[PDB]
């Protein structure tokens, strides 16, 4: 129905031929599903694989090797005919390592995207509809919604399709439509039609757009368009502007990447400058311009060898890996920095009802007034059986099933629960279980009314569906609901104005049925109902009431209590303004107490363990709830936040007590207290903000709309999968499984990702530095060249490839969740850790020039035995005072250079074994703890063995095979790099700080 906002409510109902209070017939739905199809979208598109590869070649560090591979290809056209084959290989060596990391990235990305979509599509989105099938509102899939049927939405709900508002069951309806219209602050909706058909979405103040959320209130409406025809569906199939952005940690690495890109660039020019005197050497035989190209090729090859290629890829791989690992644990990671932030998290704030608890409400206790003397007050307490939402239970007075209608106080109490109620009950035919429609606290009352068959309604012959709201519907037909004063958390109560249905209670007058937190409701009571009579509220009576609240609340069941009262003589209907909810409390004054219900809400089993695990990781868990302080503390003890006998007078505050404190004292209380109760949504964010003033990484956990500000304020917001759509929208991570332990796993994951980045850097730096100091050592001591540009590239492919990337798959340390979180002030590289780089780099650099000099001197079977003549090897051409009389071109042998190349590769493969942890020993953390690394080392090692023995290869790479004795020398020098870092690991762990 195009331009349904233009037509009135009456014209929209007749447009599809629907009854407003009834809904579509089962035959109408069939025709509309055939005519309009399902309310869904063709899954948009997805990340193209061709575009998934092009992202691997966008970073600076990768693009550097990009320009290098091109230059080496261009310079290959200036190569002489005799030495062609060697030149063509150079750019392929540079390009192959880029593809190697590109494959791992795209592969890991695909697996991450699949795990996410396999979790997003797991749980189907539902919507509340009114149809001729059932009397009460039923729950159906959003995909089966069609224009026509009447749809109900309340606070926190997500609008399924484009809805034309028929009636607003609240005094105000505010809608969060920032996802469409862009406007942040919630907007007010009305039922009046907008005459302009060409009006914008912002002018459609009677329409409810799909994908948006209801910030406040509750309305009833008819669907206008579904599927692609939706106003948000028009831009979904085209305007797909992604909200992709690099994480803070990713930006910290890219900053460090350019930091190295400058330093390496400097030391590469430093190579080309200290070798200007070799531009006119007989080794090249070229002019002063030809010899400059060779050492220029060295600088570029040394650059490629030094420049981290996997760094921009391993961070994307680890991030994607974390996302998949969270999707595995049924956790929707809405924002990429979610995992890494929970690693830094020091404080986790959390809502109580629905978050820390299962939100499976059931009334088990209730009491009314029995007898009131001058100072004596007795109560008629009752017990209710049944933990689920099924209308199956018994009211027990002294272990005896009693008739609810016998007690007049129970009649009024049940009346209140059914009338002062926006939620209902619906039976699921598929699962065979009664499901709530709306708030769990309210539905608990709905099931109570059904069990409290007050008017003795025949229900034994009703189906499971009809049994759901049978007794409730009865009461609704007794009093006409004029209007409702929605539940507000400042007043902490809800009211409903009712008039008689002109039948039985017609000769009485209007009434208001109030329901809310015991504190406020009782304070606003001036009388108490004794059956049908009324007596003034006094001291002893008020005290007796509250005493039972405290009992059930702080008891072993920790009951969520709720007071029920009525205003016998309400103000005139025309003397009440419904524009401001601030006046609603005054309308709920001069009340008369009727009774109190107490419902159990069992805490999730995985909570107590999680809090203890958080405590081991040095993470505080603060409960912030709007519930009673007595209940809040009692539950804190049950989940481990407080001791069973711990004094909590200094560690637990109400919103009132918290406000009485000076601002400076409020800030101090947040790092002290762990339990805040009777708190407004403003307090939750205020507490979070207070913790952030101490520069602590704060997380928020919740499910309701009252958590949204704190979820936005915190570093990372975690919503319950069974929570509201509002809470999820304001979150960075959604727990679909509602598993609290998944939060702890996300913490470990974040700490693991950060640690893997450290060992990745710890390896790639300490190794590449050794390559640099090796080149400078030869030029400093006077020894001949150790490596050629082609050999430099080969080391790069073999050492800075998969053995580096595999470190992103390292296991977490043995004490990763037994150590306090990393401070935001902590730098990327410690001063001690930088010494670690030079200590290893210095050895492996001198271990390479030492193996090359070993072949010249100490080598026995190795052809060529000299002493202290390596320093002066360019003299024998013109002078040979101490030379034995051997060949004058022995210093250009490929054998000693192959020794240096062999050690350089091997000693880095060993160095990668030291990159399984930071301070943990190689014995405590065995080398077989990472199979992915060992598989990369052997592949790199074997690929090096091919280059030496496969006939055409060592000629191209200018190498010669090593004897079995020569390899033993390689291992003799390479292997003790393990012991060096082992000592360094022993110092930091024991003599320093473990
Ligand atoms: N629908 C409702 N109608 C009336 N009172 C309510 C309703 N829901 C909750 N309350 C009362 O208001 C108090 C505050 O609720 P809220 O601030 O949402 O957090 P919590 O439900 O965790 O207490 C509750 O303790 C409850 O007694
Ligand atoms: F525990 Al709540 F809103 F559900 F404070
Ligand atoms: Ca490199
Ligand atoms: Ca290297
Ligand atoms: Mg709540
Ligand atoms: Mg909640």
Curated annotation (Swiss-Prot):
It comes from the Eukaryota. Pfam families: Cation_ATPase (PF13246), Cation_ATPase_C (PF00689), Cation_ATPase_N (PF00690), E1-E2_ATPase (PF00122), Hydrolase (PF00702). It is found in: Endoplasmic reticulum membrane; Sarcoplasmic reticulum membrane. The keyword Metal-binding applies. GO terms for biological process: calcium ion import into sarcoplasmic reticulum; calcium ion transport; negative regulation of striated muscle contraction; positive regulation of ATPase-coupled calcium transmembrane transporter activity; positive regulation of calcium ion import into sarcoplasmic reticulum; positive regulation of cardiac muscle cell contraction; positive regulation of fast-twitch skeletal muscle fiber contraction; regulation of striated muscle contraction. Residues 788-808, 932-943 are annotated as: Interaction with PLN. Mg(2+) binds at residues 351, 353, 703. Disulfide bonds join 876-888. Its EC number is 7.2.2.10. One of its GO terms (molecular function) is ATP binding. It catalyses: Ca(2+)(in) + ATP + H2O = Ca(2+)(out) + ADP + phosphate + H(+). Ca(2+) 2 binds at residues 768, 771, 799-800, 908. The chain crosses the membrane at residues 49-69, 90-110, 254-273, 296-313, 758-777, 788-808, 829-851, 898-917, 931-949, 965-985. The modification Phosphothreonine is found at residues 441, 569. Ca(2+) and ATP binding cause major rearrangements of the cytoplasmic and transmembrane domains. According to the E1-E2 model, Ca(2+) binding to the cytosolic domain of the pump in the high-affinity E1 conformation is followed by the ATP-dependent phosphorylation of the active site Asp, giving rise to E1P. A conformational change of the phosphoenzyme gives rise to the low-affinity E2P state that exposes the Ca(2+) ions to the lumenal side and promotes Ca(2+) release. Dephosphorylation of the active site Asp mediates the subsequent return to the E1 conformation. Key regulator of striated muscle performance by acting as the major Ca(2+) ATPase responsible for the reuptake of cytosolic Ca(2+) into the sarcoplasmic reticulum. Catalyzes the hydrolysis of ATP coupled with the translocation of calcium from the cytosol to the sarcoplasmic reticulum lumen. Contributes to calcium sequestration involved in muscular excitation/contraction. NCBIfam families: ATPase-IIA1_Ca, ATPase_P-type. PANTHER family: CALCIUM-TRANSPORTING ATPASE. This is Sarcoplasmic/endoplasmic reticulum calcium ATPase 1.
